[PDB]
Write a protein that binds this ligand. Structure first.
Ligand SMILES: [Cl-]
Ligand SMILES: [Cl-]
Ligand SMILES: [Cl-]
Length: 230
């Protein structure tokens, strides 16, 4: 029995706070939403409080809470087991023929609200590229992500494809490391996958530069994934 399973048994509001600096361009994002780990759906609206986001929203979409993923019982939920204290995650995000950035974030539970507080720092992006000129669509293709133990944390590796405006795609390569914020007991770290679909949309009434992320994440054991029907 893992304690985190009880806190996420009902939908929980969440708050996202990000500070960024990519190619010397500083930005700040503030968002809020709701996550339901019973369904694996969590949806939030995020606004760039410093003006316009210097990069395509899709490039930071899945950094703006894998604790909300729907985990079956035949998969040990390590991420939820780190609660109530929470977890931290470091990410190396590399874009094909463009730059890279590093993010560090801490996902905590405070007064019954999930807080995703993170920081992004990157450089080497093409100033005439579709990322920094924001010519990519706000559309991200479906994903499968790999989870597996490494050292004393849970490592996650996966790719992302952001649609371009001319039948092209932008490659996103991510390498993440999840570790607990406390030295308390956690669930087993075992190989498994997450099936994620993102839908980025805009609010007509919102004047600020923003994005509305509808995410549906489900965990799959390696035995059930191998026996999959599509
Ligand atoms: Cl941080
Ligand atoms: Cl870097
Ligand atoms: Cl570790």
């Amino acid at each position: 029995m893992n304690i985190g399973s009880v806190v996420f048994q009902k939908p929980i509001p969440f708050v996202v706070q990000f500070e960024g600096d990519i190619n010397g361009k500083k930005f700040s994002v503030a968002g809020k939403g709701i996550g339901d780990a019973n369904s694996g759906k969590f949806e939030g609206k995020h606004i760039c409080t410093t003006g316009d986001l210097p990069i395509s929203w899709g490039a930071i979409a899945c950094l703006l809470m894998p604790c909300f993923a729907k985990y079956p019982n035949d998969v040990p939920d390590y991420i939820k087991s780190t609660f109530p204290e929470g977890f931290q995650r470091e990410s190396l995000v590399e874009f094909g023929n463009d730059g890279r950035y590093i993010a560090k974030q801490k996902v905590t539970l405070e007064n019954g609200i999930i807080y995703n507080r993170g920081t992004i720092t990157g450089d080497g992006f093409n100033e005439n590229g579709k990322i920094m000129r924001r010519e990519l669509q706000d559309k991200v293709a479906p994903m499968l992500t790999y989870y597996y133990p490494e050292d004393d944390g849970l490592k996650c590796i996966f790719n992302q494809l952001i649609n371009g405006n001319n039948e092209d795609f932008q490659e996103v390569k991510m390498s993440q490391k999840i570790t607990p914020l406390s030295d308390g007991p956690t669930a087993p770290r075992k190989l498994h996958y997450q099936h994620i679909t993102l839908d980025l949309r805009k609010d007509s009434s919102e004047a600020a530069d923003h994005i509305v992320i509808t995410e549906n994440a489900k965990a799959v054991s390696a035995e059930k994934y191998a026996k999959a029907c599509f």
